[PDB]
Each structure stands twice: as structure tokens, then as C-alpha cells.
Design a protein around this ligand. Structure first.
Ligand SMILES: [Cl-]
Lengths: 5, 228
């Protein structure tokens, strides 16, 4: 869903 | 998937700012298949006890622990966050993730986690929150889509109010999300359904559209809360 590396 | 928002990034954040090390003993709250604690173990060697309402999930978590040759350090049980089967002062950390937004009685649960945490123990959070005012229509749309009406007043301030009664905010990192274009969304849905039908596609789109739209008003907050 949410990518933040 | 069964992971917290941000996945490995979140775990890393928790490990760094929560100071999780090999000496740590974690409570994996609503652990599902045990991703968070298992990752903390793989990364840092920390031990953990996890709880979930799903028996099968717990069994998966245990089996995965076994395959990792770590079932002496990682143990999982069927239980509710509102009634933890652990003694006072058992854990150095609680992995809360986004679960306080979904569990049935979250203050009772919070108090239980507070009870089971050691002195100066840390609560590790990754919550969704609303950064902007969202109309009722969209909330209703989401409710319709996934039978779970979110609270548009679940802002940062609200969570802070919720946690700050029993905890001290030690660290916070906020990540603002944004919607995909219809094309991108459709591309993802298509790719997934066709590379990992039309009916499925239509249903998926129907469900995901409002969720996607909602993202422009949302954010994810990574927080470390210290017991007080
Ligand atoms: Cl409650």
C-alpha cells in the first residue's frame, strides 16, 4: 500500500 | 500480506528509534502471521510473544517460527488485545502497528499493553491518520466499499490525545500519502489480477476506487511511545 523505501 | 504500513521500513524505524536489540522481548499485538516480530528477530535476534484472534494465523506464525529455528524465542497465541494472557512487566516493547484503529476496545487494550510493558518500555506505532478534512460522502463511500466506516476525526492530535494519557511521545515520523490516477489504479489492479477475471477486476476497482480517493486526505505516522 504505502512505500517508504 | 499481513504487514504494518511501510513494511520493512517501519520495522527498521521501530528498531532504530525504539532501540530494539537482542536483549529485547516484544509483544506482537494482533500479530496475524507474525511478520513484525519475525522480522525483528531476523534483524536483531529479539524474542517475542505474539497474539491474534485467528487460530490458523497463529499456527502459521508458529510454524514459520519453527522453520526459522526460533520457536524457542518466538511464540504465538490466540488472544484479544483487550485481555492479554501475560504477566505485568513482561515486555520491553509492544509492536502496535496500526492495530489500535481496528481492535474492539482500544483503550482497554491500551491499558493492557501498558500493564504488560516493563518500566520505560516502548510502544511502537504506525497509524493511519487524517491530515485534511474529508467529506461525509467519501467516508460513506468507503463504508459501502469495505463495510468499515473510518473516523474522519482520527487526526494526529486525536492519536496524541489517545496515547499521551499513559505514554510519552519519544519519536515521530509522518508520511503523507496521495491518490493514484484512475489509469495507475486500473493498471495495478489489472497487473495483479492478470499477473499474480473481468468480474474480479470490476469488483476490485469498485472496492479500491474510494480507498484510493481517500489517500489524498490521509497520512501514516510512525511513532515511539514510552510508558509513563
Ligand atoms: Cl475501550
Amino acid at each position: 500500500x504505502x512505500x517508504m523505501x | 500480506d499481513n504487514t504494518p504500513p511501510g513494511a520493512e521500513y517501519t520495522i527498521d524505524y521501530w528498531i532504530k528509534h525504539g532501540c530494539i536489540n537482542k536483549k529485547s522481548h516484544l509483544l506482537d499485538l494482533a500479530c496475524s502471521t507474525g511478520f513484525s516480530s519475525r522480522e525483528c528477530f531476523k534483524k536483531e535476534g529479539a524474542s517475542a510473544e505474539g497474539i491474534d484472534i485467528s487460530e490458523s494465523a497463529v499456527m502459521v506464525a508458529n510454524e514459520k517460527a519453527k522453520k526459522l529455528k526460533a520457536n524457542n524465542l518466538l511464540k504465538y497465541y490466540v488472544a484479544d488485545a483487550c485481555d492479554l494472557p501475560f504477566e505485568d512487566n513482561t515486555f520491553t516493547h509492544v509492536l502496535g502497528g496500526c492495530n489500535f484503529a481496528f481492535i474492539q476496545n482500544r483503550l482497554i487494550a491500551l491499558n493492557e499493553t501498558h500493564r504488560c510493558l516493563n518500566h520505560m518500555g516502548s510502544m511502537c506505532i504506525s497509524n493511519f491518520y487524517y491530515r485534511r478534512k474529508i467529506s461525509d460522502k467519501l467516508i460513506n463511500d468507503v463504508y459501502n466499499a469495505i463495510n468499515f466506516r473510518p473516523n474522519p476525526l482520527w487526526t494526529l492530535e486525536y492519536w496524541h490525545q489517545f496515547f499521551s494519557e499513559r505514554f510519552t511521545l519519544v519519536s515521530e515520523e509522518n508520511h503523507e500519502m496521495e491518490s493514484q490516477s484512475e489509469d495507475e489504479l486500473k493498471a495495478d489492479i489489472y497487473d495483479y489480477i492478470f499477473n499474480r477475471q473481468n468480474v474480479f477486476f470490476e469488483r476490485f476497482l469498485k472496492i479500491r476506487r474510494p480507498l484510493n480517493i481517500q489517500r489524498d486526505y490521509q497520512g501514516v505516522t510512525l511513532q515511539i511511545w514510552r510508558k509513563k
